[PDB]
Amino acid sequence: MIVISRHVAIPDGELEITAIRAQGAGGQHVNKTSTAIHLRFDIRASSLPEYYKERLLAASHHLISSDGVIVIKAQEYRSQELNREAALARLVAMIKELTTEKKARRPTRSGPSSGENLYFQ
Numbered sequence: 001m002i003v004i005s006r007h008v009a010i011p012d013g014e015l016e017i018t019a020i021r022a023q024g025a026g027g028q029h030v031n032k033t034s035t036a037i038h039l040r041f042d043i044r045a046s047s048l049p050e051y052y053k054e055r056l057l058a059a060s061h062h063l064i065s066s067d068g069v070i071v072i073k074a075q076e077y078r079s080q081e082l083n084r085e086a087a088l089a090r091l092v093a094m095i096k097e098l099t100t101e102k103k104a105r106r107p108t109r110s111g112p113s114s115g116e117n118l119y120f121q
Contacts, residue, residue, distance in 0.1 A: 002088060007049070012088070014047060016040040019080055022074065029068055036075035039087035042090065044068035052099055059098040071117075074115060 004011035022034040030102075043056045044067075050084035057068050064070045096106075 003069060004052075004092060008032075010041075010046065010048075014041075014045070016042065017084055020072055025113070026093075033078070034075070035078060035080045035083075036073060036078070037080060037083035037087050039072040039074065041070045041091060042044060042068060043070065052095075055099040056095065061094065061098065062115060063094065072111075087089070 001009040002012060006084040009116065020034065020036045020038045023049075043053055045068070046053075048056070055058075056064070057066070061070075063072065070091065072087045072090045074083035074090065076086055077083055098107075
């Protein structure tokens with residue numbers, strides 16, 4: 001249900017979940033498998049309230065597109081079924097951060113960040 005608030009909870013069917021894999025042959029130090037999940041959520045296409053639509057769209061995140069889409073890449077487990085659930089945790093979190101401004105009543109703990117994006121042309 002991705003319950004973000006008292007009147008906000010995605011039924012887990014309004015998202016675009018897709019699989020992501022890579023070949024073995026890499027040009028760097030790589031030998032482990034991929035078997036990851038791509039979680040794409042089109043806010044414009046969701047049942048979200050207008051207030052959240054604007055909050056998410058007006059946000060500035062190295063994982064979101066100005067278009068109105070958030071992208072997450074969960075990769076930890078050896079299957080392609082456990083990462084689909086590890087991705088929702090990240091969605092719920094970033095949504096709660098981008099929709100707010102400052103808070104300490106709920107657990108909140110920032111940290112470093114490792115990631116880039118691939119803009120298409």
